[PDB]
Amino acid sequence: HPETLVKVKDAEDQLGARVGYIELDLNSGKILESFRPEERFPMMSTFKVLLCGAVLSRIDAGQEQLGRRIHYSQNDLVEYSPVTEKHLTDGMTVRELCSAAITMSDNTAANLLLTTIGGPKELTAFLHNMGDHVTRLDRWEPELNEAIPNDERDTTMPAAMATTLRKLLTGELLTLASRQQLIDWMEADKVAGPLLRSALPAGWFIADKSGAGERGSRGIIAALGPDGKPSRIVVIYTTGSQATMDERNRQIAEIGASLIKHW
Amino acid sequence: KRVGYIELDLASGKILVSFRPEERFPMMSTFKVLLCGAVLSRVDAGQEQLGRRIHYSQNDLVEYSPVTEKHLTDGMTVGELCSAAITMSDNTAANLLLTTIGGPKELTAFLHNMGDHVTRLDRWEPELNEERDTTTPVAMATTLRKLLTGELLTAASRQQLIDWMEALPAGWFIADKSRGIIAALGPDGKPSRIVVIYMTGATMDERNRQIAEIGASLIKHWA
Ligand SMILES: [Mg+2]
């Protein structure tokens, strides 16, 4: 059963770059296995789940509404804004913006949502307040993806991210419809095909969010399980590699194949 | 049937690799390391001397006692007994050292007092090898790291504990010569990493294949 860990190590050796990984039981929160779990990695677009968690938490407390509309003005359009670049005229509701930020990784959507909560510092405050004292967001899209070596801005650790994700998706931090909306948005992720979904067998459930940035940075956070039901959380990050995006994708997909095989 | 392990970076206290690190397992001989830790804490406190000689009878000998069985006449110093209890897993030596601190409950209270509320020793040798006398990979590693780094022991005692532990893969410094293994990894006399492995089950071989697979997963702080 350390086979998966040996594969992560091989990935690290194939990429010439640090890889971090943790697998947690969704119900108990116990760590099942881990590799560099307490090293810092850039979050990249995996933060968009935590963002929409904070946006959902404010919806639950009456400070935000799903149906509130946001207009925004072409000047706000940062690169990879596939959904938001189609609604220059009419705008987009909070619900649509979370949908775009999660399912399509729309960068402008994330910035608009960040503004609704008071920016990076308020996301970081939201995290500290729920017991995550590691994860920090500092910048906006697209700067948060720079992945400068030794820069602790905009980073998490695999263990901190995994525990946080778990608290968002289970228990009572969010309401039932909110919890379910967040996991449904993650289920409907359309831009993480090459990662753990490429190794997922028939009939398995996966709710995920991937990220990609500069300087070889790539990752994914996921809740998955056999028979249409999530039972574990997986977080994989890497940074630093000079390998191609497809090689990074492949490495993550093969770690996924290993943890699935040794489930 | 079950395996759990953890490798920790000593300088940082960060977990490098883990597999079922919070499952409970019988300590088996890994308690001996912690015992020698409690002994050295007493030395540091001016309550015990490693040069102190102890005589013991043939009513003290229990199974696997390779050193102590040979010194019923002349006895053995506290330091010798610690060396025997870790390096030779000499079960009488562990029982005699236990008496010097005040029994299982006093080791267990030593651990409580240093932040470890998972690891519990209740029995003496040989009865401890049959939820009593258990730990988890993470608690044992975290406790050992506390012993070996900064605070808890003086620098004399820390080096002494290491040198006993450094007195299975060829790169591993193995404390002990259903099972527990503690290994230190790194330069002689100053390991950078510790590995703690428990297995309950087994066939000489296949445990050795499992051990080699764990060996393949081990890493170091990224430079
Ligand atoms: Mg390494």
TrEMBL record, chain B:
PROSITE patterns in alphabetical order: BETA_LACTAMASE_A
Start and end residues of each Beta-lactamase class A catalytic domain: 9-199
Record key words, sorted: Antibiotic resistance, Hydrolase, Plasmid, Signal
SUPFAM superfamilies for the chain: beta-lactamase/transpeptidase-like (SSF56601)
Gene3D superfamilies linked to this entry: DD-peptidase/beta-lactamase superfamily
Native species: Escherichia coli
InterPro entries in the record: Beta-lactam/transpept-like (IPR012338), Beta-lactam_cat (IPR045155), Beta-lactam_class-A (IPR000871), Beta-lactam_class-A_AS (IPR023650), TEM-12-like (IPR058200)
Pfam families the UniProt entry points to: Beta-lactamase2 (PF13354)
Top-rank lineage group of the source organism: Bacteria
Family: Belongs to the class-A beta-lactamase family.
Catalytic activity of the protein: a beta-lactam + H2O = a substituted beta-amino acid
Protein name in the entry: Beta-lactamase
GO molecular function: beta-lactamase activity
BP-aspect Gene Ontology terms: beta-lactam antibiotic catabolic process; response to antibiotic
Entry's EC annotation: 3.5.2.6
